[PDB]
Amino acid sequence: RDHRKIGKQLDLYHMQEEAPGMVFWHNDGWTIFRELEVFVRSKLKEYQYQEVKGPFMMDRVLWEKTGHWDNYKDAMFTTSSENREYCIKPMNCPGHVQIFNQGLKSYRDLPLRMAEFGSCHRNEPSGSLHGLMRVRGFTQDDAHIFCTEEQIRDEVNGCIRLVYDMYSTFGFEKIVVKLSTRPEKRIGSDEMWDRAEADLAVALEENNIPFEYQLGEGAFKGPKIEFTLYDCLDRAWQCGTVQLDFSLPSRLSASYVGEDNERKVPVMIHRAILGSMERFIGILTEEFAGFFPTWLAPVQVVIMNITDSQSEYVNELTQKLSNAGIRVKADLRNEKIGFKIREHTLRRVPYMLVCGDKEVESGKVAVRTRRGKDLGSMDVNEVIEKLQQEIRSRSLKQL
Amino acid sequence: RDHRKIGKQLDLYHMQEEAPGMVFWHNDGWTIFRELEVFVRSKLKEYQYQEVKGPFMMDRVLWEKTGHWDNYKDAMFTTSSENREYCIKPMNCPGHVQIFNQGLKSYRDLPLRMAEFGSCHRNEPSGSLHGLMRVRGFTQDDAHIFCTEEQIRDEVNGCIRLVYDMYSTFGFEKIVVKLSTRPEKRIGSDEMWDRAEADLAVALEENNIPFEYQLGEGAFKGPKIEFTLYDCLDRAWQCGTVQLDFSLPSRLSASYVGEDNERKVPVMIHRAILGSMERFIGILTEEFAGFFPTWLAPVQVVIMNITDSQSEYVNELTQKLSNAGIRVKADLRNEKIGFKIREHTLRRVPYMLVCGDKEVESGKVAVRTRRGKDLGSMDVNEVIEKLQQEIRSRSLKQL
Ligand SMILES: *C(=O)[C@@H](NC(=O)c1cccc(O)c1O)[C@H](O)Cc1ccc([N+](=O)[O-])cc1
Ligand SMILES: *C(=O)[C@@H](NC(=O)c1cccc(O)c1O)[C@H](O)Cc1ccc([N+](=O)[O-])cc1
Ligand SMILES: [Zn+2]
Ligand SMILES: [Zn+2]
């Protein structure tokens, strides 16, 4: 249960000192990463999130208008061009406000939910880097919700449902929720904080979450919620964050016309469910110990001949499974079938299809699982339907 | 036919001086961009391209090992960290060789086709920037093929087929192909160039392409092919490039074990079909004048009520179309139906579904196109099937 060893064994990714803290994703690791994005996109569709893409660097003058910039200016990579200085973005939020500021908005556009899979970079001390857990370049399942004060409770509800629904998909059902105190120095009126804290407290009560208040001081932007999942080793991983912001929309001049035809500043809700997805893949690799569920497995099925007489059949099957949307590989190598099955079992391929002489003549295929279970000779279409159901439902367990 | 005006009208993207040459993609522009990636991914699947992801910056020491670095060092953004200097990648190729250099390879791994949608940045003079056509950050449909000398002809054939097949999808069928001369200063033996030029010439003859030899000097890496499409205004756009490389794999220490058990340097083939995809969207926006084909349209269907009596029906329909994989929006605003239809026609929505009292009671829906064609009342499932066929086939024209 070391994602760096499993990552190497399954050829998921690598790192080198020429680019510290930045992942080289190999084909199979990138497959897992794209599948996670597909999964995230399907869950946001339910809430009608927009999906946007912001630029990788912006003028330092823009970043200086955010606020508590001094505290983070040390962690950003900077660059320059034509006597102008840029920061590689360490966060997507100011870019999202730029998109919100294009076009007059009014109350009828809110809540405006805007998600991005945007790569961000931070200049972390090299001594703290570790595998996929602590990186310099990361992509989170990021989004920002622009809403009114009244809409906070409903919007925080949606985030809560999204956290519990996405975590359970992977088998994470023990979840701890920590609310945050209000620090000495904050932006915003006391009244505005008091109402927002009421929204958060009401939203957690309706869902019956047992929350604690965290001992350390919270942010200056607004109240904050952090979600911690526990893996099968009962290890704690803080992944989800919901952060209210009364500061950034005002600093970057976001506004909308309200019902009273009066110009107002939207509330921003920053939130991420998985957090850094490089890290979440690290957690998953260890949670499953490399036995990825079928929908996540880089290679879902391997089809093998016993002799060269079945090679044309195996290629036919492979094309058929591939056209049915299954990540499938043919293994036509000159190796004994017991050698091939063992090799692909060690590489954690969910299903293994064996094609001898009986199967070419019958139109069927012999099915073995990576756990060693012998499922017998099955019709090709039966196998396809069963595989498609396991994939579309993102089932955690096999047939 | 100005993509910057159409881009603004349809709310596809914007740019600002805080990040010159770098696109802020809005929801609808990003939808087009992701659809293009889906399309590219489906065409590469046919050739079993891998898809990888490399880091955004690498040590300047690595970039200096490439060769003709002096010529391009002026165009890269540089940054630094812990008394070490990095270049924001202006190209994906050295990152792909790093991935190839992880793991011993042999002849049985070749050809190894490795694609990436990787964002790259170049420090272009601000005076040359223009819309989506000349940017500082761009993503091309990039790939690198590692192969043997013998495999060049077959590999170049695949690229040729991919160029003609992808361009025709968008309606581009007039294509001009230019081969390149051999410059005075080149890397590689004369013999190695002579054989590779024979591979390229044979590959073009088999496909019956009329090629010209370009007047200007070619690259020093190897022979080169450029493909130029013509749009409906008969404007020439050079998009595809196939560039042989005998230099980079040797400089960055790529090798494989051959059949004779002898260590050898692979040939690299750099290729892109669409080129910069920001630019290709610009070309498409002008080619279609904003009337995107259904599969590309940011919003494929809009469903409208006439009064509040049909709102529940419209929401039901919307959820049904959405579950069927159609990008669909309900328009329940308090506006006359003729006003709503005109508005969504001006925004180039392919299909418009009108729900009055007759349609709620009949279970049908009235269909109007963005060209003004009245298709009559249709069963909901008929509409879904027709829409799914137009989408899955990426048809250029409506029903
Ligand atoms: C304030 O913005 C706070 N943001 C978050 O905690 C946050 C959580 C989930 C999603 C998004 O988009 C969020 O912004 C804070 O700014 C986060 C932050 C910490 C450190 C640095 N840094 O460069 O050292 C930047 C941002
Ligand atoms: C040599 O590599 C040549 N490459 C290409 O033309 C190319 C075409 C299609 C796909 C890929 O991946 C390619 O590399 C050349 O290096 C391209 C290049 C031009 C200019 C700069 N620059 O930073 O000024 C970098 C690379
Ligand atoms: Zn944020
Ligand atoms: Zn290249």
Author numbering:
A (entry chain A), B (entry chain A): 242 to 640
Give the original sentences from the paper that presented this experimental model.
Aminoacyl-tRNA synthetases (AARSs), a family of essential protein synthesis enzymes, are attractive targets for drug development. Here we present five unusual crystal structures showing that threonyl-tRNA synthetase (ThrRS) is covalently inhibited by a natural product, obafluorin (OB). OB contains a β-lactone ring with a 2,3-dihydroxybenzamidyl moiety attached to the α position and a 4-nitrobenzyl moiety attached to the β position. When ThrRS catalyzes tRNA aminoacylation, the Zn2+ ion recognizes and binds l-threonine, assisting in the l-threonine activation reaction.
We hypothesized that if Tyr462 was mutated to a lysine residue, the mutant protein ThrRS_Y462K should also be covalently inhibited by OB, because these two residues have similar side chain lengths and lysine has stronger nucleophilicity. OB increased the Tm of ThrRS_WT by 34.8 °C, which was 2.7 °C more than that of 36j. Interestingly, OB also increased the Tm of ThrRS_Y462K by 36.8 °C, suggesting that OB forms a covalent bond with the engineered Lys462. To visualize the covalent bond, we determined the 1.9 Å structure of ThrRS_Y462K in the presence of OB. The overall structure of the ThrRS_Y462K mutant was very similar to that of the wild-type protein. As predicted, Lys462 also induced the ring-opening and covalent bond formation of the β-lactone. At the same time, coordination bonds were formed between the o-diphenol group and the Zn2+ ion, and stacking interactions were maintained between the nitrobenzene group and ThrRS Tyr313 and Arg363 residues.
